[PDB]
């Protein structure tokens, strides 16, 4: 039967300089022949370490791999923000009899010290409201840690069932994450009531931010 | 030595899509090749591998799924009768010490819904400003943006794409630029849909 990576944990963390270590167990032994990659948010995969502890060319040295067997550790060193991405072994031991499986991957997390959000709300356009929907938009930019919470009320009357957040990965730069609240709503609701207000509560602000409009105005 | 993947495509339940891996630089004479796939959000799965004599080696589950060929410098990925297991980020990869080359990716849609371009509406500016573009409506996955043709790059954050309950996509692309700029740069965001053959340029503004 195929051999079986099973990676933990599922998501590792540490700060800015600091090392995570990520495992793999192989449901056989494999020897030496494991592999690692890096794969950051759009990108293919990256190759870092094969035969278990040999480093890709161009490959910091940061990036560590040990063991043989059934057991093998990856190990990241000096951690960057940079890194925050998902990590993946793989065997290729006589992959004409066990196949080449990857492990299920496992999430970094760069922790850095908190960052509140600068948040911002955008009314629908014009040219939308021929649609017949309007979409209402609550910003939170480069906030850290990714816990937010985002309220949204029309009239003073909290609202739920009608938003969806999206949240991109940690900046590369900076560690920090971006938030879109997207409130939707028919024309005919939305030309109904006037204010429409988005508080954000997060660590990083010592009392929530409101940003509101009136429609109209 | 690079390799590219094409022929993603939304395609019909039980339609067999053919997948090409074009190679450059190295000989399929001289190494293996692997397809491995990854379905949004999820983890890389392989699929199988072609050795430079011939010989096909398939993932327990791919056997008789998928067909791999390949000429004097491609590689060819069948998928014999698409599902919606199938909807995936296709890679190809070449084999020496685990999989050291790899393509961009070739995305996989199975679905019986039609494909339909996006409306991009702005997100207007209300000493740091925020503007955007929302992408609206639209299907199969993917959609970009840049912005200013790709002149503007700095503090641009493109949000993941949401599925709908009304079974389209919907996004926004947002960046912050100095407050003072608004009055005398022009921001313009780029948003291409290839599967519909939508490329849009709006110029987002204050609204007087």
């Known amino acids: 039967a195929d051999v079986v990576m099973t990676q933990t944990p599922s998501s590792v963390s540490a700060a800015v300089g600091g090392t995570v270590t990520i495992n793999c167990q192989a449901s056989?032994?494999?020897?030496?022949?494991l592999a690692w990659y890096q794969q950051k948010p759009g990108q293919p995969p990256k190759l870092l370490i094969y035969d278990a502890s040999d480093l890709a060319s161009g490959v910091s040295s940061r990036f560590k791999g040990s063991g043989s067997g059934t057991q093998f550790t990856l190990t990241i060193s000096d951690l960057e923000c940079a890194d925050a991405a998902t990590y993946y072994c793989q065997t290729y031991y006589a992959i004409i009899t066990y196949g080449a499986a990857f492990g299920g991957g496992t999430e970094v997390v760069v922790k850095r010290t908190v960052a509140a959000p600068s948040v911002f709300i955008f009314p629908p356009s014009d040219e939308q409201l021929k649609s017949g929907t309007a979409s209402v938009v609550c910003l939170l930019n480069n906030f850290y840690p990714r816990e937010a919470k985002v309220q949204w009320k029309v009239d003073n009357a909290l609202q739920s069932g009608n938003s969806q957040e999206s949240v991109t990965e940690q900046d590369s730069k900076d560690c920090t994450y971006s938030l879109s609240s997207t409130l939707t709503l028919s024309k005919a609701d939305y030309e109904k009531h006037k204010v429409y207000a988005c508080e954000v509560t997060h660590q990083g602000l010592s009392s929530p931010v409101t940003k509101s409009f009136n429609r109209g105005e | 030595q690079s390799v590219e993947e094409s022929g993603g495509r939304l395609v019909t339940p039980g339609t067999p899509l053919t997948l090409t891996c074009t190679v450059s630089?190295?000989?399929?004479?001289?190494?293996?090749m692997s397809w491995v796939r990854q379905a949004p959000g999820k983890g890389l799965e392989w699929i199988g591998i072609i050795y430079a004599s011939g010989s096909t080696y398939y993932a327990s589950w791919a056997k008789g799924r998928f067909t791999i060929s390949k000429t004097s410098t491609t590689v060819d990925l069948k998928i014999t009768s698409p599902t919606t297991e199938d909807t995936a980020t296709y890679f190809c990869?070449?084999?020496?010490?685990?999989?050291?080359?790899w393509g961009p990716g070739t995305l996989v849609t199975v679905s019986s819904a039609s494909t339909k371009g996006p409306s991009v509406f702005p997100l207007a500016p209300s000493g740091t400003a925020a503007l955007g573009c929302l992408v609206k409506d639209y299907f199969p996955e993917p959609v970009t943006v840049s912005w200013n043709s790709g002149a503007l790059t700095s503090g641009v954050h493109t949000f993941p794409a949401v599925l709908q309950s009304s079974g389209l996509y919907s996004l926004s692309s947002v960046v912050t630029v100095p407050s003072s700029s608004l009055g005398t740069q022009t921001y313009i965001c780029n948003v291409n849909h290839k599967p519909s053959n939508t490329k849009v340029d709006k110029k987002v503004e204050p609204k007087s």
């Open positions: 990869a070449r084999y020496y010490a685990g999989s050291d080359i």
């Open positions: 056989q032994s494999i020897s030496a022949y």
């Open positions: 630089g190295f000989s399929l004479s001289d190494y293996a």
